[PDB]
Curated annotation (Swiss-Prot), chain A:
Effect seen on changing W12L: Exists as a mixture of monomer and dimer in solution. Is predominantly a dimer. Crystallizes as a dimer
Name of the protein: Outer-membrane lipoprotein YfiB
Entry keyword set: Cell outer membrane, Lipoprotein, Membrane, Palmitate, Signal
Membrane-spanning residues: none
Mode of membrane association: Lipid-anchor
Curated annotation (Swiss-Prot), chain B:
Keyword Repeat applies: no
Disruption phenotype: Deletion of the gene results in the generation of a small colony variant (SCV) morphology in PAO1. Mutant exhibits slow growth, reduced motility, a highly aggregative and wrinkled colony morphology, strong attachment to surfaces and strong, exopolysaccharide-dependent resistance to macrophage phagocytosis. The deletion mutant, although suffering from a tremendous growth disadvantage, shows characteristic persistence behavior under antibiotic selection and during prolonged infection in vivo.
Organism: Pseudomonas aeruginosa (strain ATCC 15692 / DSM 22644 / CIP 104116 / JCM 14847 / LMG 12228 / 1C / PRS 101 / PAO1)
Compartment(s): Periplasm
Protein name per its UniProtKB record: Negative regulator YfiR
Function: Negatively regulates the activity of the diguanylate cyclase TpbB/YfiN, leading to decreased c-di-GMP production. Inhibits TpbB/YfiN allosterically, through a hydrophobic interaction between the C-terminus of YfiR and a conserved region of the periplasmic PAS domain of TpbB/YfiN. Under reducing conditions, may also act as an YfiB-independent sensing device that is able to activate TpbB/YfiN in response to the redox status of the periplasm.
Subunit structure: Homodimer. Interacts with TpbB/YfiN. Interacts with YfiB. The YfiB-YfiR complex is a 2:2 heterotetramer.
Activity control mechanisms: TpbB/YfiN repression is released through an YfiB-dependent sequestration of YfiR to the outer membrane. Binds vitamin B6 (VB6) or L-Trp at the periphery of the dimer, and both VB6 and L-Trp are able to reduce biofilm formation induced by YfiB L43P mutant. However, VB6 or L-Trp alone may have little effects in interrupting the YfiB-YfiR interaction. GMP enhances the binding affinity between YfiB and YfiR.
Keywords: Disulfide bond, Periplasm
Cystine bridges: C34-C73, C108-C115
Entry PTM: Cys-34 and Cys-73 form a disulfide bond in the oxidized form but maintain their free form in the non-oxidized YfiR structure. The Cys-145-Cys-152 disulfide bond is well formed in both structures. The Cys145-Cys152 disulfide bond, but not Cys-71-Cys-110, plays an important role in maintaining the correct folding of the protein.
GO cellular component terms attached to this protein's record: periplasmic space
Residues of the full protein shown: 38 to 186 of 190
Positions that bind GMP: R23, R138, H140
Amino acid sequence: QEQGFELRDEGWEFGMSSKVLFGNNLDRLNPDSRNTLTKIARALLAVDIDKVRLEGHTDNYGDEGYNQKLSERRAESVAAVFREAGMPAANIEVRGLGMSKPVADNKTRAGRSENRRVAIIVPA
Amino acid sequence: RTSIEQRSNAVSQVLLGIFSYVRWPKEPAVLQLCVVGPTEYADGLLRGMVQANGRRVHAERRAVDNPDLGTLCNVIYLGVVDERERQQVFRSLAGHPVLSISERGTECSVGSMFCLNVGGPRITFEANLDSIARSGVRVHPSVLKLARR
C-alpha cells in the first residue's frame, strides 16, 4: 500500500549522484564510484534485495566487438563490488550491451560520457 | 486465473504504492499522470485516483509524439510502443522531473524506471537504477519491497 509517506530523510540512495559512469575506454571504478556502489549495495541489502542484473554499455566510438567486450568488463567491475559488499555471487547476473542501447546523444562529449555506464537492474 | 478488471485494479494499487516512495522537487497540488501509447491495464488509472496523503491524481491519455510530455506530467505510464516511439518519448522526457512506469517489462534496459509484469498471480516489477538516477525525482529504496508483496 502507501507506506512510503511515512519515510522521513533517511536512506535516499538512488539520486542523481548514484549513476555508475566510466572514463573513455576505462573499465575500472574510481574511489567515489566504489563508495556509491557499496552504499547502493548496502541500501539494497537493507531492503532484503540480494539479486541484481548489471548491464554494461559503451558510447559508439570504435569497433563494435571491442565495445561489446569493454561493456562486459565494466559490468564485471561492478559485480566485484557487489560481491565484496556481501551480495551472493550466484545472484549477480552480468551482461554487456556494447554500443547498442545509448541513453544520451553520442554526438557530444557530455552525451558519450553519459553512455559509458553500467545500469543496475533489480529483478522481480 | 486473473481477469482484466482484477489486473487493472492491481495496476492502480501498485502505482499508488510506488508514488508514495517518490518525491518531486516541486510537488504539485494535483499529480498529473499521462497514459501514453496502447494499454491494456490503464482503464482504472483513467478514472482518476486519490493518494493516501490527500492529493488527487488526474489521469489523461496523451500522444506519443506530444513534444511537451515532460512539462505536462509528473508521471508517465507507458504502453506497448515501438522502438522509434519509445525513443521519441524519452527524448521528450529527458531533463524533466518525471516518474516513468511501463506496462510491460520486456525492455527495462533503457527508458522506464519501473517495468511491470502484470500477467500472473501478483504484479511484480523490475527497477532500473540508472533510469531512476537520471529521472530528476527522488525514489526511496524501500519502494523495492512492493515487487515482493
